[PDB]
Amino acid sequence: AELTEVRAADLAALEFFTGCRPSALEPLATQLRPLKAEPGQVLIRQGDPALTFMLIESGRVQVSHAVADGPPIVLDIEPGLIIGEIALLRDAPKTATVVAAEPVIGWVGDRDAFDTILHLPGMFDRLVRIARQRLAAFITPIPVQVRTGEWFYLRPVLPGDVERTSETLYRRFQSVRKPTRALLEYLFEVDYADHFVWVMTEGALGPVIADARFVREGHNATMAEVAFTVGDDYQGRGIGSFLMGALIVSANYVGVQRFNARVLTDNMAMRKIMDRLGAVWVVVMTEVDVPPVDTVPFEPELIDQIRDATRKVIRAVSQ
Ligand SMILES: [Cl-]
Ligand SMILES: [Cl-]
Ligand SMILES: [Cl-]
């Protein structure tokens, strides 16, 4: 096998693999297959099983999602990324068609080959960074005014945010067969189905200062646990209350009908949040229905923006 050495070689020369030694890519070489495609060619058809990912060396591709009612909704991406890795890890059927807009050169691997990549030095963080950059393009932070009169910016979490934050990861993602930590961790960073996190930032592109999440009690449950965090300087400023409003809009839109929570005696704040939905305490715990979108005290236009942001980010992460 001499191809393998030559393979490793081409791989090493990709932007994607900058700073890896060609030899250290030799096993991965054994697991990747080159692909060439012509303009117009389907690289991935909607309804296909998720069997492989593709690493594209060069060639612009076009992603579209066919809707049963009215024409397919379409988008470009430049090369240098991986496509199909979410569906692959989720074993879901593809929901979006992908077509070569330009001649396409690249590399196809299975899930084991993707796990190989995840373990190569530097590579898990690099993949998270590529995901973060791709997703940022689908986020417009929404300026929001908290009851203090301070302005912050509301946006879905991004891959890489340090607040995104193993056993908790499996106990969710239990539908991934024979998984690795690395596979679970990467899916965690790009998950907007089972997990939905809202972040509030100091300025439109500034640090996260608070966050709120729901975690469905199983892949697709209408019951979801909630948790809120608020940074140090920022307590008692109306923030968790606001985020809860964002969290309600997102739940409704994706069909989460119920919330549960539990934590410390100490943070009344959390009790006060659940309180406002008429919680039921039994360190303490509760369940509540998610109220109708009706009752979050935000302007209709803000409701539509939070829903569209929810829409866009889910759609980014649907392959
Ligand atoms: Cl891209
Ligand atoms: Cl699986
Ligand atoms: Cl580790």
From Swiss-Prot:
Question: SMART domains attached here?
Answer: cNMP
Q: Name one GO cellular component term.
A: cAMP-dependent protein kinase complex
| GO molecular function per UniProt | metal ion binding; N-acetyltransferase activity
Which cofactors does it use? Answer: Mg(2+)
Q: Which UniProt keywords apply?
A: Acyltransferase, Magnesium, Metal-binding, Transferase
Q: State its Enzyme Commission number(s).
A: 2.3.1.-
Disrupted-gene phenotype: Disruption of this gene abolishes acetylation of USP.
Activity regulation information from UniProt: Allosterically regulated by cAMP.
- The reply to whether Ribosomal protein figures as a keyword in the UniProt entry is no
- Highest taxon in the source lineage: Bacteria
Residues annotated as binding substrate are F228, T229, V230, G236, R237, G238, I239, G240, S241, N267, R276
Q: What is the effect of changing E225A?
A: Shows a lower rate of acetylation of USP in the absence of cAMP than the wild-type protein, but in the presence of cAMP, an increase in the rate of acetyltransferase activity is observed
Does this UniProt record's set of keywords contain Lipid biosynthesis?
no
- Annotated N-acetyltransferase domain ranges read 152-303
Listed binding positions for 3',5'-cyclic AMP are: G84, E85, I86, A87, K94, T95, R134
**Record: residues binding Mg(2+):** E202
Question: Could you give the subunit structure recorded for this chain?
Answer: Homodimer.
Tell me, what does this protein do in biology? Catalyzes specifically the acetylation of the epsilon-amino group of a highly conserved lysine residue in acetyl-CoA synthetase (ACS) and of the universal stress protein (USP) MSMEG_4207. Acetylation results in the inactivation of ACS activity and could be important for mycobacteria to adjust to environmental changes.
What name appears for this protein in its UniProt entry?
Answer: Acetyltransferase Pat
| Natural source organism | Mycolicibacterium smegmatis (strain ATCC 700084 / mc(2)155) (Mycobacterium smegmatis)
